[PDB]
Amino acid sequence: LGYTGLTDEQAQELHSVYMSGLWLFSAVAIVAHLAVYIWRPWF
Amino acid sequence: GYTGLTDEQAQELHSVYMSGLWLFSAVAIVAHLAVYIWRPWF
Amino acid sequence: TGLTDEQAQELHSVYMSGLWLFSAVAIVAHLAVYIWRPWF
Amino acid sequence: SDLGYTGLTDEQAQELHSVYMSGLWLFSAVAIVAHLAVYIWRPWF
Amino acid sequence: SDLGYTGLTDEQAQELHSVYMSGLWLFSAVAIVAHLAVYIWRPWF
Amino acid sequence: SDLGYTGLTDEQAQELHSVYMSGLWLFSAVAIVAHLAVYIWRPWF
Amino acid sequence: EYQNIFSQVQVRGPADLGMTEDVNLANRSGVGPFSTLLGWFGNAQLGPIYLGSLGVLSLFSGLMWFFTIGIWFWYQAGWNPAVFLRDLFFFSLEPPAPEYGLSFAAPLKEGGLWLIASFFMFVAVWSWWGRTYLRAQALGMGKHTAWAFLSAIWLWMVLGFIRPILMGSWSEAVPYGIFSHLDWTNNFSLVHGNLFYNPFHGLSIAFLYGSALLFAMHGATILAVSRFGGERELEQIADRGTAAERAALFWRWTMGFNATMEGIHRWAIWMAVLVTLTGGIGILLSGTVVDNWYVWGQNHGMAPL
Amino acid sequence: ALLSFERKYRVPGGTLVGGNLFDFWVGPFYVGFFGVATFFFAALGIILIAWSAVLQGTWNPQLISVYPPALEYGLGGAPLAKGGLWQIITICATGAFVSWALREVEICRKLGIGYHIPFAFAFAILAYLTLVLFRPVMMGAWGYAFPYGIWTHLDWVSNTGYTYGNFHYNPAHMIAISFFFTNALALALHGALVLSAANPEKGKEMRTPDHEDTFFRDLVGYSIGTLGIHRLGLLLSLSAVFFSALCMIITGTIWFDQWVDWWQWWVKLPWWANIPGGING
Amino acid sequence: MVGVTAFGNFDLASLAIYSFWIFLAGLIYYLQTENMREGYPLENEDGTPAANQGPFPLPKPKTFILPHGRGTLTVPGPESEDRPIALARTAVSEGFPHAPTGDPMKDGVGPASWVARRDLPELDGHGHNKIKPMKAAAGFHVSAGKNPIGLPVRGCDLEIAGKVVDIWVDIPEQMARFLEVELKDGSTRLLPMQMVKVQSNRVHVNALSSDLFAGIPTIKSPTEVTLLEEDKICGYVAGGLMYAAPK
Amino acid sequence: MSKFYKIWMIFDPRRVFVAQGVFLFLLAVMIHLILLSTPSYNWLEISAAKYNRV
Amino acid sequence: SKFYKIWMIFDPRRVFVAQGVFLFLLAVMIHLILLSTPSYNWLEISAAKYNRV
Amino acid sequence: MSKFYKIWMIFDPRRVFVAQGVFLFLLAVMIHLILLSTPSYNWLEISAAKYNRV
Amino acid sequence: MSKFYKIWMIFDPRRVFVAQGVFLFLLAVMIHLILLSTPSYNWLEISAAKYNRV
Amino acid sequence: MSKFYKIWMIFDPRRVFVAQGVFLFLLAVMIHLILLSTPSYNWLEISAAKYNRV
Ligand SMILES: COC(C)(C)C(=O)C/C=C(/C)CC/C=C(\C)CC/C=C(\C)CCCC/C(C)=C/CC[C@@H](C)CC/C=C(/C)CCC=C(C)C
Ligand SMILES: [Fe+2]
Numbered sequence A: 001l002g003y004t005g006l007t008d009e010q011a012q013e014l015h016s017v018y019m020s021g022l023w024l025f026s027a028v029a030i031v032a033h034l035a036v037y038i039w040r041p042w043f
Numbered sequence B: 001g002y003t004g005l006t007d008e009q010a011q012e013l014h015s016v017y018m019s020g021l022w023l024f025s026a027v028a029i030v031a032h033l034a035v036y037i038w039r040p041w042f
Numbered sequence C: 001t002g003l004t005d006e007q008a009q010e011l012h013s014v015y016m017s018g019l020w021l022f023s024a025v026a027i028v029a030h031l032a033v034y035i036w037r038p039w040f
Numbered sequence D, E, F: 001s002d003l004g005y006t007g008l009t010d011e012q013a014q015e016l017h018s019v020y021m022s023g024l025w026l027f028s029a030v031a032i033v034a035h036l037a038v039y040i041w042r043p044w045f
Numbered sequence G: 001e002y003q004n005i006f007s008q009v010q011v012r013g014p015a016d017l018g019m020t021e022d023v024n025l026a027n028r029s030g031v032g033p034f035s036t037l038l039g040w041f042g043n044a045q046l047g048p049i050y051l052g053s054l055g056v057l058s059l060f061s062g063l064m065w066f067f068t069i070g071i072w073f074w075y076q077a078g079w080n081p082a083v084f085l086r087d088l089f090f091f092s093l094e095p096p097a098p099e100y101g102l103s104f105a106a107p108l109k110e111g112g113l114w115l116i117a118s119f120f121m122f123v124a125v126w127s128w129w130g131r132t133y134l135r136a137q138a139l140g141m142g143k144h145t146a147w148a149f150l151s152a153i154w155l156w157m158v159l160g161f162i163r164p165i166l167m168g169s170w171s172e173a174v175p176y177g178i179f180s181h182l183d184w185t186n187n188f189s190l191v192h193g194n195l196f197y198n199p200f201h202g203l204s205i206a207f208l209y210g211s212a213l214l215f216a217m218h219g220a221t222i223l224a225v226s227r228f229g230g231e232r233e234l235e236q237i238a239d240r241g242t243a244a245e246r247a248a249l250f251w252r253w254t255m256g257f258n259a260t261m262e263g264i265h266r267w268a269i270w271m272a273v274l275v276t277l278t279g280g281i282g283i284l285l286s287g288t289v290v291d292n293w294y295v296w297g298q299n300h301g302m303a304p305l
Numbered sequence H: 001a002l003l004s005f006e007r008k009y010r011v012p013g014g015t016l017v018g019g020n021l022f023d024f025w026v027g028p029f030y031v032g033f034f035g036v037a038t039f040f041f042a043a044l045g046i047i048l049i050a051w052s053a054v055l056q057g058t059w060n061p062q063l064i065s066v067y068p069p070a071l072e073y074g075l076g077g078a079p080l081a082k083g084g085l086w087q088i089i090t091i092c093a094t095g096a097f098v099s100w101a102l103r104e105v106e107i108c109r110k111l112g113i114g115y116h117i118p119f120a121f122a123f124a125i126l127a128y129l130t131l132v133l134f135r136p137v138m139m140g141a142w143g144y145a146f147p148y149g150i151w152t153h154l155d156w157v158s159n160t161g162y163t164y165g166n167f168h169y170n171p172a173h174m175i176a177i178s179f180f181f182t183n184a185l186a187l188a189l190h191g192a193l194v195l196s197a198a199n200p201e202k203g204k205e206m207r208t209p210d211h212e213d214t215f216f217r218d219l220v221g222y223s224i225g226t227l228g229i230h231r232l233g234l235l236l237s238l239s240a241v242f243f244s245a246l247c248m249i250i251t252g253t254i255w256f257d258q259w260v261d262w263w264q265w266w267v268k269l270p271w272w273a274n275i276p277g278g279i280n281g
Numbered sequence I: 001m002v003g004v005t006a007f008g009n010f011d012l013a014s015l016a017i018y019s020f021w022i023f024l025a026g027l028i029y030y031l032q033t034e035n036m037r038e039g040y041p042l043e044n045e046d047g048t049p050a051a052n053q054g055p056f057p058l059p060k061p062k063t064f065i066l067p068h069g070r071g072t073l074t075v076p077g078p079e080s081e082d083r084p085i086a087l088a089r090t091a092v093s094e095g096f097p098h099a100p101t102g103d104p105m106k107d108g109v110g111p112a113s114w115v116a117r118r119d120l121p122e123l124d125g126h127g128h129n130k131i132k133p134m135k136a137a138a139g140f141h142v143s144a145g146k147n148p149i150g151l152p153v154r155g156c157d158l159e160i161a162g163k164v165v166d167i168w169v170d171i172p173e174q175m176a177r178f179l180e181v182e183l184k185d186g187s188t189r190l191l192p193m194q195m196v197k198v199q200s201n202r203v204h205v206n207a208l209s210s211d212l213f214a215g216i217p218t219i220k221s222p223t224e225v226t227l228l229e230e231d232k233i234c235g236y237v238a239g240g241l242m243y244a245a246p247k
Numbered sequence J, L, M, N: 001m002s003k004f005y006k007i008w009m010i011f012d013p014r015r016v017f018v019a020q021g022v023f024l025f026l027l028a029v030m031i032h033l034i035l036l037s038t039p040s041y042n043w044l045e046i047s048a049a050k051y052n053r054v
Numbered sequence K: 001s002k003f004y005k006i007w008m009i010f011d012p013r014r015v016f017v018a019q020g021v022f023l024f025l026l027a028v029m030i031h032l033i034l035l036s037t038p039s040y041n042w043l044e045i046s047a048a049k050y051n052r053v
Helices: A008-039 B005-040 C005-036 D010-042 E010-041 F008-041 G053-077 G081-086 G108-139 G144-167 G180-191 G199-224 G242-255 G261-289 H032-057 H085-109 H116-129 H135-139 H171-199 H208-218 H224-251 H259-267 I012-034 I225-242 J002-010 J013-037 J043-050 K012-036 K042-049 L005-012 L013-037 L042-051 M006-010 M014-038 M044-052 N006-010 N012-038 N043-051
Strands: I062-067 I072-073 I087-089 I098-100 I129-131 I152-154 I160-170 I175-182 I188-192
Touching: A008 I072, B005 J002, C005 J002, D010 L005, E010 L005, E010 M006, F008 M014, F008 N006, G053 G108, G053 K012, G053 L013, G081 H259, G108 G144, G108 H208, G108 K012, G144 G261, G144 H171, G180 I160, G199 G242, G199 G261, G199 H116, G199 H171, G199 H224, G199 I012, G242 I225, G261 I012, H085 H116, H116 H224, H135 H224, H171 H208, H171 H224, H224 N012, I062 I072, I098 I160, I160 I188, I188 I225, J002 K012, L005 M014, L013 L042, M006 N012, N012 N043
Parallel strands: none
Antiparallel strands: I087 I098, I129 I160, I152 I160, I160 I175, I175 I188
């Protein structure tokens, strides 16, 4: 467990931030794909 | 052991990794099912 | 390598368990393919 | 009267050789079964 | 007597040579059987 | 003196030469048998 | 007449085992015997071989690429060694026919085995990357070992996987011959008119020459200071001795502009990577961009019109 | 001008003509007796290439061209509208490269290092001397030389190369081409280790000479050391120009055929040349 | 872009070249710059910072962290020489060589210079001297080489100067570096293997004469050669190449 | 199969994870490209031809 | 029989890493050999059976 | 096995096992490839010929 | 014949065995390949003739 | 001829033996290959015509 020296609290906070960013980006991607599919579906 | 991990540490790490593997595999199963329904390859 | 008889015993048991699992999956797969389309 | 590069004992070499021969006999038996199966299925002579 | 370069004894060389000759005779016997089988199956003379 | 660079003795060289000549005679005998067999089977003269 | 070629006095002994900071000694064991001829030419230590995970990874995929192409070649040879010996370096492993083109439905004879064989050499070259890379990481070196190596792979990749996909055909990759590759390189120029007016090739033409031409002098500068302590180069940046001091000014006096020990080795890899980096984009343009260099060079007044 | 440590390295002696003559330094560069000769010829040699343009009338930057005489004229009267310009511009550059190389030895002697750099360059020039007064003359006239026009960029392959077919099948050329790769593949590692030890992982120490061997030994399994490469780099690079220029000579009056057909000489071998099967037989 | 230029002739094709024109020149500026780490800023004969420095400036001085626990070197810091440059400027006027005032070989000018190194007889990364005497070389021995013991040492001027006793061998390179030639005077002189050319049976010194054998610089430690002498010996030894150009 | 943690007693997790990441990514790329290669299975081609959108 | 003994003489780590590389390469080779043949190129027969091409 | 067992004394077992494994796998692969190259023993083809798989 | 056994007193066994193994395998391979080229002795072709598999 | 034993006093037996073995084998392969190449004494070739195995 000595590869970076981060704490459980530090890793918790960092992971929460990263997941928030991931969810934001994924939401934008979902909106984009929905818009394209409505405009022109690829199935 | 190359690495000095404990039994408890390895237990926790393996549990986490297996959880991730099961999640990813579940997504893969859903995807394959969707494709096969849409267009089977058999 | 300096492993003990007990250590080698445990490691070999684990490895054989894994081998049997993998081989079982392979057997199932081959059976499925052969039923679907035999190659003999 | 070991006489190796290797320092193994007579007992160690005995055990290792027994193990290796067991493995060889197992593998050879599988090979014999396979060749018999192929020859029955389609002989090459 | 010996020359003295690998350092093997007369007894050690005796045993090693006996083992090697046994192996050679075994292998040669198998080869003889194989050649006989092929010649019976299809002679090359 | 014994002019030895290799340092072998007269007895050592005697034994080694006897062994080598025995091997040479064995090999040559086999060769003679082989040539005789071929010549009988198909002479090249 | 002693132009610094041969060691005159030969001294030999126990090889250094090796020095470890962060090296996994589990993968490193054993030492090797000593080479005869190079002891006149120079050093003789052949080993040790780091049986590394990537090295093992490269060990098989290279070997399978090494061996498997042999067997399909024998299928050409008719199982006759004297036939195989004669038309050695005449056997050539073809890619799939252009009807398949991009499509990976090739038969084994008709280039199917190329994609089979080529996938394994695809594994080996990339896997050797880290074997260089990771070992530096253990000893804490620069990663230039990696970045000069990727220079080749970027152009090595475009020959097979990048340039052919942009059109959409596997024929436009290189058949695996000893002579079919060489006929292919000439064939490439003929396909797109002449390869003459292809710029990034013509740029690459300069820099392969820059490799050996410059380094003949660079070594000679070191060869000049084997009397002046050239073989202790590592601290000759740190402790600038007469090795660094004298010759460099000769490069001031001949060329006007001079350099030092540390920056002189920048030119080595940095010029060298121009050998491979330039071609990778350069070979692209013939297929997907400029189908005939003979007319394209006419645009910018380097062609006769 | 002078570096922070140069000054003492300039001693007015050893010069090839006479020890103490014309050995002043013009700022960073040095101009001397042999210092004139390359400056003498290169200064005009460029400018008559400018006069090459006017004979055509073109001034488009690359479209300026210098045209060698064909086989016919040789050592005779030739219109400068065709020749006696490429023939004279031969005089300038050819003198220059000899002038510059033999210039170098004086400052080499001054700083007391080997003649290898003049030796290396003088041998590098020997590739060029192969191209004019050697390859043309060995047949008999400079017609068999490529034009000294910039826009040609050595585009004489039209009749040059394919008279020999696939020309990378000159045996020496097959050897010659491979050499620059051997240099360029090895070149990285010396450009690596001394620079990768000079630059370690940002945050790691500079390396020691004991570190130097271990990296290369565990990788491919053999270290000759630093000097082996510098010698090989000189062994390689001069061989590459040596095996390239030599085969240039044996294109003329030695090989008048197609380079592929020579490899058939192995396929010509009476023992197993004519066994049916495979690709030939 | 299927044969489709943006307009006329300018497309992605020329874009790569136009990229390559700018891309190259930036590196060449960087390549010129990173070679500028010794002897800058430029000086003149007098010692003033020169009028011309050039468009390419000094790159940032990065002090290297050093191994062995010896200390640190800051390169490029202020460049120092700290060595005998007692000389005579031939001309106050700009652009003239510098005549040797007294004995140049003590000072070291032209081919005779010798640089101020570290004063440490260099140990290896393992903590032992890189150059080790044969007698103190534990384990290694003369294996298959022409042991110079038995070869009369000959100078350029064709006088027998000495005879070899030991070789101070390079342990890392496992190739010989220095040659013990103790002279008839009494001092034990080392000559680098690289400098002189030995054939099958003699030891010839083609750069300097047997008179300069008498002044070959002495070593303070009969067991370890110091760095400063290394050049100072060779600077002494290699300098006479031109002073003894006659003879 | 609970006993499988001994491999983590054997293998440093970081390198296994990075090898796995490269492995999975390259495999997904290869499968996707083999798919898209086939005219039969090419979702872009299928959509283009079905919806008459050539 | 009893094959525990190999481990105490022969290294584990190398065994597992080499075996992993071996199995992946082997599986890829066999799969590609299948895919190259017209029969057992299951994509093509899938197309032909559902007659979509 | 009366006297064969001394062989492991003169040969280091680790290396002989490595070499044997490499040799065995190479041999099996080579023989299988040779077998396939023969049109009579292309076990893929026999399946194709029997069941009339085009 | 009786006293050959000093050859091991002359030679190191292990190198002799390495050479013998390489020699024997390479020899067997080349003999087999020549037989296999030999139309009279390509058992794989001979298997085809007697059984009317083409 | 009687004091040929001094030959081994002059030369090391091991090197001579290596040379003899290598030379003997290279030689034997040479002659066999030449016979196999010549059509009269390619002993394989005759066997076909005598038995009419084609
Ligand atoms: C003793 O007997 C044996 C058999 C062991 C031998 O010794 C035989 C040994 C041999 C070496 C056999 C002879 C075969 C060689 C000579 C091969 C020579 C190969 C070349 C000359 C070509 C090398 C590379 C050429 C190029 C340009 C390759 C393209 C670069 C890569 C990017 C190619 C990658 C291609 C693809 C398709 C990757 C994707 C994989 C798909 C399946 C997705
Ligand atoms: Fe340097």
